[PDB]
Amino acid sequence: GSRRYDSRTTIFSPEGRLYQVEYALESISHAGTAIGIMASDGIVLAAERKVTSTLLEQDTSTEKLYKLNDKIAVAVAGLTADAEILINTARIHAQNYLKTYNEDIPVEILVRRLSDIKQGYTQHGGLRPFGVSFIYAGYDDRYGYQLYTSNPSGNYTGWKAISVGANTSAAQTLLQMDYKDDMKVDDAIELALKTLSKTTDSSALTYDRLEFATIRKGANDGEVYQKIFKPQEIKDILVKTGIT
Amino acid sequence: TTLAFRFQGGIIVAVDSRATAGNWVASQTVKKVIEINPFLLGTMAGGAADCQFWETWLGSQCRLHELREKERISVAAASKILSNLVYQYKGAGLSMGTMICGYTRKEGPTIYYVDSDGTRLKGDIFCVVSGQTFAYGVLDSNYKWDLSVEDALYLGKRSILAAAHRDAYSGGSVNLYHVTEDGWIYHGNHDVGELFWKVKEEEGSFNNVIG
Amino acid sequence: DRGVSTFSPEGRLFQVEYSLEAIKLGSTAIGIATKEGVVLGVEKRATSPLLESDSIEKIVEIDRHIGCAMSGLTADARSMIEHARTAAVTHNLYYDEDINVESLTQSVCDLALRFGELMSRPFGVALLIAGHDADDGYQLFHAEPSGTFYRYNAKAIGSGSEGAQAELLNEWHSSLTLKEAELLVLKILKQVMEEKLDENNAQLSCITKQDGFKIYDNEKTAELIKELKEKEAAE
Amino acid sequence: QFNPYGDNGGTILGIAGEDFAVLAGDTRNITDYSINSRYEPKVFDCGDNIVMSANGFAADGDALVKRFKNSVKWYHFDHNDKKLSINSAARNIQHLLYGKRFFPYYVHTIIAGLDEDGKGAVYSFDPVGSYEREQCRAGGAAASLIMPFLDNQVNFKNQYEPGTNGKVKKPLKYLSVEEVIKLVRDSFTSATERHIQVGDGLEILIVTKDGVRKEFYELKRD
Amino acid sequence: MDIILGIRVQDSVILASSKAVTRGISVLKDSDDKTRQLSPHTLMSFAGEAGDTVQFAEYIQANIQLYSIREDYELSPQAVSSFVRQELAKSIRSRRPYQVNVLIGGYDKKKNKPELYQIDYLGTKVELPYGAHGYSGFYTFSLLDHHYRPDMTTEEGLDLLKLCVQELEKRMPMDFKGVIVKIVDKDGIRQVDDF
Amino acid sequence: SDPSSINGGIVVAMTGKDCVAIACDLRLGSQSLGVSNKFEKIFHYGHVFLGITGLATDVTTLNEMFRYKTNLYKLKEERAIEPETFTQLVSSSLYERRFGPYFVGPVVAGINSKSGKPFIAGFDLIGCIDEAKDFIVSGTASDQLFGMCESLYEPNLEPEDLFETISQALLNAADRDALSGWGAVVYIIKKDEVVKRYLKMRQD
Amino acid sequence: GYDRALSIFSPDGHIFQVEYALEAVKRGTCAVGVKGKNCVVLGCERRSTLKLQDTRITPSKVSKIDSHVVLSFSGLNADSRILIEKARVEAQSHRLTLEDPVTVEYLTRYVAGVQQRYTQSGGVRPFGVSTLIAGFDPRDDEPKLYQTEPSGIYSSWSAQTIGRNSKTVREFLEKNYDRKEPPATVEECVKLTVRSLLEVVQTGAKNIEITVVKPDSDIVALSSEEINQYVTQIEQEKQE
Amino acid sequence: TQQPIVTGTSVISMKYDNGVIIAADNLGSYGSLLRFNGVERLIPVGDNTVVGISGDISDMQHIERLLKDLVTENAYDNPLADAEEALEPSYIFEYLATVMYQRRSKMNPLWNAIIVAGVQSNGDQFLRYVNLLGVTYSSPTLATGFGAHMANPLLRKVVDRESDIPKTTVQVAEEAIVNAMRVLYYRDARSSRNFSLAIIDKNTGLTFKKNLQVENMKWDFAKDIKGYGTQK
């Protein structure tokens, strides 16, 4: 019958690893580098677009940085199509929580749910896992500013600064060197860009090859603003930090 | 008429033995106490079938608990199994008014009233006279906490007689049970016909009669 | 790969034959049926001395008149025990009586071959089901994952089975007392067990008409071990 | 609208002796003021020395007897031909009746046989499966006519020892099969006179250790 | 019929709930606690159809307790009330609706403020300084309209509630067999014995 | 018994010169008994305002539902929903419960951010659209509001004039309805500013 | 639905998927359980390959199931969440129907039951997780420590370890844990648990987590400094 | 649950020494309208059974098809379909009885009263009744509707108990049935002069008579009647 052609996507290797999860992680390692840095007064999300063209409309383009609600954003590394499936699920879960409790969803609860969905695809159904790693940048009134990552395994962990996709080994070494706890957003912006600038496989880091976003309490009084940087704004912050 | 009350000596449980189909007396010899296990009793009021079937079923569920957990089911747990079941059937027309009476080391002597309405109540005394359920005895005047076991058995027996006389749908015989640590004890079946005349002569009560 | 319900060229179900190998790796369980009762004994086999042995439950009550000992993947037995208990109680609810030991066994064995592509594989555990009923008296049954069950005067399952069964072949007669059967289980367990038999790494149980199914205290089993040592030293 | 129930009348009577039991019923089947049959049996041998009668709505009665008969067959298959005790039969019938709790069988069920001690047994059910073991039970249309007579003549109710003036009750005594059959015949003769749905014939099934035997007596046909 | 009152003072919420359980012309119990602790700083009183009342309260209690264990955090009274409302709002259009009216008294540790919520079986929710369900409702509303102040102390709140119950005992035609009073403040939930 | 007159309340919306006004009472009751005088019936999703009369549980439920739908809209569209579009969303959402409806009388008010054209609309409980130029009314005193609006209203009123007209329309309609009053709110909406006024009115 | 039998028997009578699941556990960070006279302690390893971690928000290795029972694990983190959620739901479900919190044995039996079901159900692979479940039964002062594994077998332990280099720390406990006289105080019990982890951990810095569970729902997680004081005292005594 | 539209009236039947007789008029009434005057309500099944049906004619036509389908199905893989494994009256009846009771229990009955007349393998007379409630009974004489009230009294003068079955000839039995059909024509408002009669004999087999008419009717004493009392 049909058994003949079944890849068996949800089995252990003799070494006790999940084949499809490991191979999905191998996929993600080739994706454009995404960096998250958490400061005392906000969070930075920096991400590199993969070998673009001069004829790609950049101002209306979005492959890396997505908005989940007014308080939470994600940086993507892997299959964009797979990510969009999960993002719409997360966007609905956030609105379900708001409808039920009349409060914005705590960051960890949203992260745990998305991570629980990825886990399911590794334990039952016989489908391939989602070839996606996320960096979650969020704010709630319990833990304040938070950075998380999830991977196809459905495991998630919290971070002060983290990278996903290409050259994470190199990126994580550079972040671990220059990061301090008392660090501010303006400094965290400079670190994020300096890190990509050194890890990038491209000849030079330019505005047309970057997506950039900040979550700041830099909003009039006691509230939080999400800023998805426009092409011209990314060009300005590249001159300011002195990379171009 | 079902009576279950608590005292220093444990739990007294007294019930009549009459079943009615309208104004027709179907039987004068019905068991209205179910012996769920050596430390658990269930009284029966309302639908004869509903009580018999579901309190027998409760005995099965209480037995499975003992096998799975290697321990006597608590009166609270046993009562709630029956209360959660009848609640599933709420509005379907189940008629059931039961007192789950038992002793456990955990709780001590315990009486739970369970209703086909889904009501579940803990109390020191529960009574079912006519079609009404009361938190007090049919008489309540003779009630003191520190009562002799054989004095307390009489109050239960006398209380069913009181209701059996006045109520047309109560009568037959009085079935008495004494619940203690190390299980319940049956204290016999007393025909109301013979009991009434004996009680009258000895107590000097029921003067409004004549004989 | 190949079907889970596939027949071998010899006319055996591969998965059933493979599960029988899993049961051979299991800890020893022995049953002896007499006219005075049925004795059930097991090797506990703790993997470490830090493991509290009393927590090892390889002898299990199904009803007051039916006990059960297991050998193999003991985790697989939990759902089989659950079904047996439910069957025993359900039959008492429907018929106001104790269920026949054979009927209870037949009920358990009806789960056995409910696997395919129902559960994904056969059970990896064998059961000795001991009991009493008015019709056929004291009975001992061997329930396999094949769905087959045999009645036995005495039976050993697990790692030391073929060694134990050869010993039960010589020792069993129709006139055995309960006290004799107890000692005989302890004797054969002590023979096939790796570690030295004491009250902590071995467990006795019996089913009598009067007292029903009882798991023996460690203090009680200890005395029967001391009684065995003395009677073997007596000749 | 469509009414799924009907009344086929008739009356049944169960009396338990010391080492025997009888289940009797009239053979008349009626609808409204019409007689459907003068001889349509209502008491059946179900095997294992159990006799059964479900009296009321004939269709529901026939259905229940069929299901119980089938229940006896499958007891034998599933339990190595074990004989179904009367207490076990009674519990099984309770589950049959309660199965249709919210669409009841409009029948009064009596079963007769011997208990596991070899003593005569009668069990009586309501439509929804409430049951109780008794010495006496009449069921059906003329139950109200017969039961009081049985209270007086079988259980010796309101009967005292002459010369005591109500001080000592008449002693309870097991009746012989010959005495019981007289009470059954007089019960039905009396019921036939005063109940329009009772008459035509009387069929009695007597249960002993030896087996089930059958007696028939004509009743008035008006 | 059942009295359930709520009064939110300066620094606490007080819930008075009638002790009697009656079915028809019979008093089933005279010491009934018509309340469940949802969380350490959130209390729900309930009145309505038999079974439904306890069944709903215990179901809500279980869900809030589950949230507490999973997040190691206490839901705000506003959040708990919104959850409860949504559960009742589901039930009205269900096969058999829960006929339960509830008061939710809570102390929000983040805002250091007491909050009282009145929700009916339809899922109608309002935040009030004082609330009530049933026949007693209209009377207690008119009386509290007069005497209530926002800056009242817990002791002042109890006296005003004492006056309401006293007045209800005279005016109401049913014996509700006295009330059980519970206070919800920063220190948690305690029962006032003397009343 | 009649769901749409248990809790009571009213909403009225009017168009002016380059502005719209929407107003509601503050009462929530159990028939005759008044429970709350803080129950606002006007909600806003960006620059689109929605007033809802009828069964209060459904007022609250639909508010929560439209907040949900408009939030997802904004995330996907990357712009705030416009009045004309939101009107179609309300209609859709109400008619999908055709044989089990929400017992509400919704009212949409707002200015189209691009065209600058003032817009009002009303709905029946199954989502039929009434798109009037002049005014929309809803609630237990709809008859009273129809009478007041039909005489008081004139087209192209300035924001501060329109305020007086809608206010007098609500206040006098509410005083002739038992289940309406206990305070009133009036929103004056211009292209890029919105003023909210609570009105003094008899509390009986 | 996907029905494929992934957990099947092999000719030698082994279920490889269940045995490969145990390999996942072997890879997992070390977890240890030690019960004293009037307490149980759950020690857990945090691999120091991950720095720049936010320890405030990072999922902690010891999870409360109820106020009186805790669950630690070794193996796939993602898999552990599914068992913890099921256990937490069952804990509230038991309180609701039995009007009493679960016993530690009952909660263990349930979690073990779930693990077993995933070894003979179609379309599913076994849990790559072994659990240590510790706590005190309602109104009981007797300490309880249970272990579960992917196969679904469970058992009670005086002390036990699971995960990478568990063989080494089990060796330590087998010679250092006396049954006749278990750790009398909380101090003694925590010390023995820290000592056992120091055999394997590497640095005694942020690599050791300790959770102390006492009777009557008294559960507290020790801080970095509190644990660091135990690490300091152990090595100063060792220098001799 | 419905209500009968087009209906058939009485079916009457009795046992005699060697077999059974059954009869039914050829009318389908539409309430008070006698719409259909060509309706056959005796449906033979093999050469040993006749099924007489009263009540809703749509439900009768359904049952007709079930029986036609029953004969077809019995023949399948049955070399003795026309011998030892032919359909018996008792088989055909029990099937219908099962269907009737199942349909009443789903509150969607076949709105009919059915009489199964036939002779068994061993030559035993079979006569049994079933109706929309699944109620069943057997008697030496059976009749549905008005027949129960008017036919049975007449047929039970011929066969009162089981002991008169052997003393009753086919000549006598047929005479009784034919007389009963005339009485029903006199007195039943929804009946017709035209009827069908079927004899199932253990010797002569199945004789099916169509287009029979009620004859020898008494009307003459109707010229001697005027007014309702005082009219002369």
Next chain:
Amino acid sequence: XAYX
């Protein structure tokens, strides 16, 4: 059905 019968029904104390």
Next chain:
Amino acid sequence: XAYX
């Protein structure tokens, strides 16, 4: 609802 509204209803030509």
Next chain:
Amino acid sequence: NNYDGDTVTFSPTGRLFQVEYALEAIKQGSVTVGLRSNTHAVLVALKRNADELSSYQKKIIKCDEHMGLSLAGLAPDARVLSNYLRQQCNYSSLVFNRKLAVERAGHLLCDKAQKNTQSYGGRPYGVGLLIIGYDKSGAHLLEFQPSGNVTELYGTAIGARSQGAKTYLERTLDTFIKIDGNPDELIKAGVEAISQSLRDESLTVDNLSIAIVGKDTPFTIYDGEAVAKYI
């Protein structure tokens, strides 16, 4: 070889190997004999023990008062198929008041076995059955193979060394068919037939299992000292 993975696969010579492997389970099974006259039909079964402490596996199952079978192969499969026959015999009685014809019982078993040989995931039945019965057309003996093939016979045998008993019956055909109104002599011929399939072991009191059905004889099984008469 490559075509024996599942029951849904034909071999290049048009063979179903999984069915043929199921047929092999029968040949491993203990011997059972069936034979009939015009009046009576008899089953004789050699029961097999695990060892000397073990009981002798029951081979004969009752299906109705007038029908039953003997099994050879997987006993659990015999239980499933016998339970199905019990239900079909039961359905025939309840609905049609008709004792199920033995020929039709065969047709029903055949159709049940067939479905398991044409569908993926399932497996063939691993048992052979000898169905005896007395119906309206007299005594009947059927042989069921889990290929689905059912055959009406005067006599036959299935299981290990069954060929010995089958040869004997083929010689005795003219003799045993004429044994009318003599149940004991027909059993004698059955016991003498199964005796041709024995090696080393002989027929003991707890070894031999006999069943009979006939004109005025309900289907009854004889075990223990009830068969000592025929040893």
